[PDB]
Symmetry: D2
Subunit: 134 residues, 4 copies
């Protein structure tokens, strides 16, 4: 599970949003610091939380990686991103996780839901998971 | 973390040892049933627990995926295996995880340690993690 | 924490239903094996799952320990129980959880909900948590 | 459960050191925000981290709640504290944990260990868990 101190949207933001991420091995430390083991893959969308919230407002579509769900939302434009792949998945802790970098520019698909009570009142509907990029 | 009901060696055996695994999408259900989210990658060694315990008994070498550790052990022979890769990493639960199959035959490297009190007394030293395959 | 391989009803039964429990220090081992740390308190209702499902048919009331919920149900009568209190809550693991036995006879209040798809199809409504005892 | 971003000493201080805590129902929110479920009990020692580090210099004793450990230390004197007891342990989440306040003055016993690499280098030995109070 996610760290209990974070809402789904807050944990989404920590993992999936970074406007100018450093190289993956550095950028991933901010995520893995909250974990017991290294995340095997992660995509940083180079955008803002507010921008993703706006994408939550368009037409509801099927989630490509969760095909029983239809609370997903696709961006109208391709966005710059940085994908990170764990090179040493046998790592037993987070002291030494190494990542390969794959920059790109793709549409993204997010699942959105009603906010958590701990979420800011500014956005009643928020992204809760990055489903995929296209 | 691992499920607390299992020792490191017991959880290793559930993930890493299967003599005749079915296709990955089926085989992985046995692992993911104990998890909240799908495992992103997994290698089934087509061998027995006792055989891996014997490999724990050879010369201690550096762990390729944990280079500050030197409690790893490499098999003397290549062993048949099945590697499973998660095709839909955006899956939000374990109901629908889909895997790609990659059979192979490789040396394996395991980290071994003294057993847990809950582990069987038969093996005082046991494999606790699959570090990598070669 | 509930192990994901169990439904809420299955986990409820494991923690809260035992017709003839042994001493608490023995009885609690089965529950604590699913945990990283000793459970601080646990009440074993000396009853059957069928008895509790019957109570789910009683008048719904507000849950005393979850006041925003109204799917709770109080037993019409007191039932025999074994309450277990953790003697050494400073324990850092589950190697030696020690409990004081407090046998008794009290009313119980359970929350009841529609069955999980994994639950038996023959009980459409099942107990999912022990709210309190009186 | 201790969030991995904290050392044992840091997590000890968060749970067990508060010089002037507010009412328990307020004071416990900071601890329960790191948790999925309400903590059943918690003792706030009204002291300073420097005071507790001094106690680590006292005569080592067997840990009362961890009898296989001998790195515990008892305070020479009673110290002011606030003990908090969970009123509604049937609570299913941390939305409304309610606590009873039990102010007091007791001896405390802490386990002390060598610092984590992430801990300040200026205290070579630090408290890592509150074993019990007397
Ligand atoms: Fe993992
Ligand atoms: Fe606990
Ligand atoms: Fe708990």
């Amino acid at each position: 599970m996610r760290p209990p101190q974070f809402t789904r949207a807050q944990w989404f933001a920590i993992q999936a949003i970074s406007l100018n991420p450093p190289r993956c091995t550095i950028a991933m430390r901010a995520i893995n610091n909250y974990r017991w083991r290294c995340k095997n893959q992660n995509t940083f969308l180079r955008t803002t939380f507010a921008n993703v919230v706006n994408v939550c407002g368009n037409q509801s579509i099927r989630c490509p990686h969760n095909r029983t769900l239809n609370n997903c939302h696709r961006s109208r434009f391709r966005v710059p991103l940085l994908h990170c792949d764990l090179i040493n998945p046998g790592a037993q802790n987070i002291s030494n996780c190494r990542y390969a970098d794959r920059p790109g520019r793709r549409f993204y698909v997010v699942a959105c839901d009603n906010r958590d009570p701990r979420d800011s009142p500014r956005y009643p509907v928020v992204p809760v998971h990055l489903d995929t990029t296209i």
